[PDB]
Symmetry: D2
């Protein structure tokens, strides 16, 4: 059951958050954030730039000083603070879900049941790691006692995208805070509002000032200031592959800060002829269309074995034509608008390219409403590997269906990509499932499902889909600096 | 390639091994060991008893003293010694395989290609663990540094059976020595010879005196003396469920030594109607008949789905009738004799029991040769769950085939046992494989295979099939005593 | 800050708890529990025996059936329920602390600030483990996929003592519930009340019926029924070394259930000449006198280097004479009564023995009040290793001070014990601290502190102080049954 | 215990190694490598450039194809191959130690007893990891089975320096090969020879062609070609902080390959007034002067507490004045030449700067012989933090001694560096040791020792000394690509 929304939630936080206080930008500039369902401005937001980032980094560094409240805090108590934050978000769940829908466009039912549930589960998962990520005692040769300390990496710059604003904030804050780091976060200009409200909850939860600082603003200004900063120890970036390159170059060109990247995808979803047809059709639809198609790991190359191709396509088209596009606050709506004008235009561009290059348009193909950034669910059949829509990340409700004959053929075609974020296989056969899950070059392989995320299981890219992993125990690795301490002892014994 | 065997290998070692030297029993008693293919005495062996065990325990305790060569030795160097021991066993592989066949009865080709290969792999695997089983540094509350040391448990009594004499010795020595323990081993009275030769190789490898001591002799004398010893810290026993109970009671009645047990089985091998028939028949044959049926994990309840039952049984009877029983030094031999007269009689008793209780005798059922202890490969059909031959471990070449209808039914029937050592499922279906491997109450579940052991993967029982695990990283747990050290520090920081 | 206690709290729960309901004993018998500060009966409690244990085990087995709510529950949700339980205990903290004082005798300020705090920290720590105790994927040889599942051991019998009633309950329930086991718990006859109230909170928190069952009653009746039960998979026992032997024998004589034991101690507390004198005197006092001396790990052999002996003894005696013995609800009280008349008499017996065998009585030595079980803080000087008071666990406010000269001497004397639960070293010297922490044969070594427990760091015995470990990640091992699944695959690749 | 060297060892390998074959450079160009003891050319070496790297990367990629001999090889067998390689290096130890001395300049006794020993220990350690770096099975929410595979990262570019040619090769090849990667290694132009002979032994050991490829040549040609290559998945670079920046920028600018960096240092060695003087002096001397000062972790800021400063400096000067500089094949020689003329001149430049900026020249300060690149052991006293010789890595036999008063002062001064590779503390006091080891911002902290490396314990930088760790279990992390497989199952149970 979903509690009724407030379809026009008040905005309470719209400034830069440093040392648990709200600041205007040094410049006093602000930028609009827009409701993509109407095209109207919600409010102005402080436009942070290099000077605001510098204030935030200094606050983070101070909070990280040896002997500070955050450094001296018991690891178990960091876990208590993460659990308190989750409880505050749960108290404010309908507000945050409605604000998420207002600013991003996704259906309120999904913001409520999916995004907010996933945020809670991620924070509560990482609360549990705070006092369990042990270092080692090590049986080195000779008369020595050797051990490692797992220390925090330090001041962590965290740059996140607009597609799942709250969830991406939680994927970053969970592991960083569980391990005792401090954060300077740059939220997406398209969707800054929910993360700023969460900062108020961070203060309410009792995190020391300077442990989390949030600088809304643009990428080449505030984002680049983080990535190039001389006193930021680590940057974690989620966004496009194009900008990932910019981040890695900025790290190398500045202070050799540690880098992890979660980038784009063109994930293959492989339907073998023995798959359960009804389930495969529904999951392939979800795999592509979830979140207005705005998912890094979207199943955007649907490979279907030739003996079931015609039926699969018929059913897929029927399901796409039935998908309800509308006001994301209406309970019947399955698909809201795209996040903004830039994305709307890019997706229409890709649709035009698909038409021009001779893919078979089977449904949709155009705008879905006269106001707001709504696009019809669009399906192309008879897609070929060299087509632009088979290669480039579209990030909208545009499905590609490709036909194949053999399992060996489809492995090669699935893997012939510079992306490698996710993939899936639908089959009833044990051996085909094991053959494909081993052979696919992707960070997550789903078998008979898609978009199954768990705070316990890592996620991230092969190839140019990124480096490092988020979620699970693995998500702690990039937030830890390892120190070996090797001590002379009188006489080592086993 | 298998090198030609010496069919009458010389015996060099037949005494008690303490402090790297050979000793008679205090009583000067010896016992004969018999070649089960001919029924003739091979030689006599020192008959160790309580006073010999007491000498061995004192030697091991002395080798374990703080400051001793074995306690000071670098962990990496324990790994080098295990690797040297494996190289010496490899040098003497053809000799050891023939001596194993002479004393135990198994085909020389199998001693050579299987037993000795698995010994080498077990020792080389554990050599690699010697310097890698780390303790932890722990983020405890307060101004403390807390960590754990993984220390050796100490003097380990290790009692092993006769069915895989060299391999059982290696499964015990590998983890115990990798972790810096010292050992008093009691080898089976039926097959003492190969383990005693390996003691010569332990000295040759360079292990300090007293690190491994071996006492051949009987169970209620030397075995019980180890189990009840006031200065043995840990006992690892492999053998019958009946004697496991005796060991656990001895431990509780003496000094509360730590105990692990690897006991009997009545493991179910489940053939679904979609299995590959030819492979399932061959694997079900192997699963039961391997090693003259003398395997704790033998697939001794073969459950076969009703639609494929008649064909599976026809094929199984044909394969059992074709199985070549004979001199284990002849390369054509698939099945040697049972290990001794006691086991021979017990198996004849169980064959008669199956006949008396109305199981359908489909082939075999009698004595296979004049000399030695050879039994025909025997297959019973239409076996029912309440039959004694369906419940009790037979430990010979006697196959039980049961019919079932549904996957839900077979889970309940397979699990309705007080044993729980292993199980298998043959199916092409991903979901049936996952359903059954989850639901079966067994320490190892094989899927489309049987008797697949790896030094890397743990093995051990549910229920009355044992407690604890051998092999893998898990095999190190029982050989480690954990010490927490918690140190006051001036000011704890993350 | 400590809230004012209800000095005569009401009792709401005094029956057997099975399937989330309250039951009389089948026999309808009850037994009294006494307030040790007054010697008066608080109330009657249902007297559970074998028949009530049988009902509880059947309930636990049913709750453990494959497909049950508790088996199907997400691991993360088990963590949520443990966190809910902790929140309910915190809500009822003032009541539970007063009830603990009423039934056990410990000072209310300690119940509130120490026991209840530690209960909350233990449950919250293990809540975090619920979804983090991973099995392994294992690179076995050959064309196979091999992995382990960490499954619950099953029906766990848990038998606990009276010295820290709520904390001992939490140390058992935390790991068992985090790993998905079900429990039949036998609480101490001397202190049943607080654990029964916590059962009401387990129901309130939402644990499925049958997951936790609690049977108050006596040892040889209800305790033995659990230890010998044919359908209990695992027993975890905390109590005397004498009864540990009984439990281990019961397990071996019944169904080979898995066993862990947390037993007695006679722990050495070593004060080197270079210790900080004031700190060492205060910590040595705490080490022995904490919880009316009723701590398994009490520092009951205080070894003091000869050059500082006279001053340390003078200061220690002054501290003992200043220790306020009285009503445990009075804020000034440092020491309450002993738990019952049996213990009261036994401690007085040991004080008599100490006098008879030639130890120097420095202070105390008798009863401290004419009502309730109060004993004077008692210090014996010039104690020798062979004295009964230097060997046997007294479990009361009776301190032994022994003199030593050298570091080798004290290691050897500390280790000449069949106990090995804990030890401590007070020294400023790095090399002395490392030499002694390595050389001492004890499950926990404290350096410049004592009785520093954390849910993160394991605790348990060497030698006859126990086997297995509680707390930390280690505390999950005995609650896990390991299953290997090994699957044939078309072609294994790295 | 050192075999007499061949002082003019023959060179057998001087070409590019690709697919287990020797190749000239495509250009046919060669470059000289010089014997630094004489300044004379040993031989010419193939001058690899971009086209040679391209051939190497293609060969590595082919060897990494799914289904190849290296991809299908059992993990345990990778370990056997590493052990065989170590055996071959041991067989050729005397030759390799002499060749190392000839090309690098370090004393032969040290090549033989230290470098070659450490190479053997590294490879044998990693051999043991090959089949033990498990992935996880993960208790995700819902009806799923989720697990991770630890797969190889793929084609690994490895760029190494000249200071420990064989050891740096081993630190790279050990973890990369244990985890099943393939390698394109670029050895330092100053010391290519020993790594090329090791390639011959890699072929001899049985590694499949293309698994290890070695391209000698210069940095901006062959090194840059690897760092910028579009089909190299990971680069591991050891060298100067300056070139580390170039590598990270190349990775970002090309294909977003994974990067680890092991860079320079200016490590503080802190001597407290309570240190053992004789030991601290000798260890401080070793800390700085080991390997002609050519060690990334050299203790090049020796901080000495004011009370012991004068004595420490007097003893340090006596030791530096007696250090034997000479022919590295002479057993009396403690210090050989610097590796080449460039380094020789740089070090003399630093000595000049030290004198100019007002450090007190206490001994040495000039050239030590008329031929070869020999420099006198040089000690500067009264060094201050702002002096060039206190900030910049000198990488030669030039010691800086700084005075301090308090432990708080020295933490701040030690940590006021953009380097953070190592540090050490000399003290007898437990609390000072723990205070400093926690507070020092360095990847390794030695206590009462220096330059204690073990294959078991990780090593790497904080700050601009690098990112990632080599050695230990940690050394495997950067060579692993993690894949999550999440499988729908009929009904998940614990
Ligand atoms: N952290 C460690 O474990 C470690 C170990 C040894 C040496 N070092 C450091 O190494 C340095 C000394 O070694 P060096 O003089 O060989 O260092 P360097 O940076 O000059 O060269 C190291 C390697 O990189 C190559 N290289 C040079 N320019 C390159 C370019 N533009 N692109 C790609 N590769 C290039 C070189 O040819 C060589 O193989 C010191 O700073 C020392 O501290 C660090
Ligand atoms: Mg953008
Ligand atoms: Mg027997
Ligand atoms: Mg009692
Ligand atoms: Mg250079
Ligand atoms: Na918006
Ligand atoms: Na025999
Ligand atoms: Na009571
Ligand atoms: Na050279």
């Amino acid at each position: 059951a979903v509690p009724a929304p407030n379809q026009q939630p008040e905005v309470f936080c719209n400034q830069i958050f440093i040392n648990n206080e709200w600041h205007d930008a040094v410049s006093r500039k602000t930028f609009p954030t827009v409701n993509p369902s109407t095209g109207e401005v919600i409010c102005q937001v402080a436009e942070g730039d290099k000077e605001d980032v510098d204030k935030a980094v200094k606050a983070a560094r101070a909070a990280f000083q040896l002997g500070s409240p955050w450094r001296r805090m018991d690891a178990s108590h960091r876990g208590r603070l993460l659990n308190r934050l989750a409880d505050l978000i749960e108290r404010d769940r309908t507000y945050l879900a409605a604000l998420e829908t207002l600013d991003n466009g996704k259906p309120y039912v999904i913001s409520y049941l999916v995004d907010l549930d996933m945020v809670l589960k991620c924070l509560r998962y990482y609360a549990g790691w705070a006092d369990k990520y042990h270092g080692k005692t090590i049986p080195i040769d000779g008369d020595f006692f050797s051990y490692t300390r797992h220390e925090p990496v330090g001041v962590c710059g965290q740059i996140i995208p607009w597609n799942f604003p709250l969830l991406m904030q939680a994927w970053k804050l969970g592991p960083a805070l569980a391990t005792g780091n401090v954060v300077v976060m740059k939220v997406a200009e398209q969707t800054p509002l929910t993360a700023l409200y969460v900062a108020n909850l961070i203060k309410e939860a009792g995190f020391p000032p300077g442990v989390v600082n949030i600088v809304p603003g643009f990428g080449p200004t505030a984002g680049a200031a983080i990535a190039s900063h001389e006193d930021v120890d680590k940057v974690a970036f989620t966004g496009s592959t194009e900008i990932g390159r910019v981040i890695q170059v900025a790290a190398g060109s500045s202070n050799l800060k540690r880098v992890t990247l979660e980038l784009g995808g063109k994930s293959p979803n492989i339907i073998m002829s023995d798959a359960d047809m009804d389930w495969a059709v529904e999951q392939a639809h979800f795999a592509l269309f979830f979140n207005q198609g705005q998912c890094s790991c979207a199943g955007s190359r649907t490979f279907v074995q030739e003996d079931i191709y015609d039926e699969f396509v018929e059913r897929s088209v029927a399901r796409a034509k039935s998908r309800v596009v509308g006001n994301p606050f209406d309970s019947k709506t399955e698909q809201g608008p795209q996040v903004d004008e830039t994305q709307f235009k890019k997706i229409l561009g890709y649709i035009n390219t698909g038409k021009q290059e001779g893919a078979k348009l089977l449904c949709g193909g155009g705008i879905a409403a006269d106001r707001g950034y709504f696009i019809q669910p669009t399906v192309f059949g008879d897609v070929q590997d060299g087509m632009t829509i088979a290669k480039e990340e579209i990030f909208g409700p545009v499905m590609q269906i490709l036909k194949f004959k053999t399992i060996e053929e489809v492995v090669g075609r699935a893997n012939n990509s510079t992306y490698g974020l996710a993939a899936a296989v639908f089959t009833k056969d044990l051996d085909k499932a094991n053959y494909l899950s081993q052979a696919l070059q992707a960070g997550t392989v789903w078998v008979n499902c898609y978009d199954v995320f768990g705070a316990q299981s890592p996620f991230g890219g092969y190839k140019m889909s990124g480096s490092g992993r988020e979620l699970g125990e693995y998500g702690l690795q990039a937030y830890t600096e390892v120190k070996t301490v090797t001590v002379k002892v009188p006489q080592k014994n086993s």
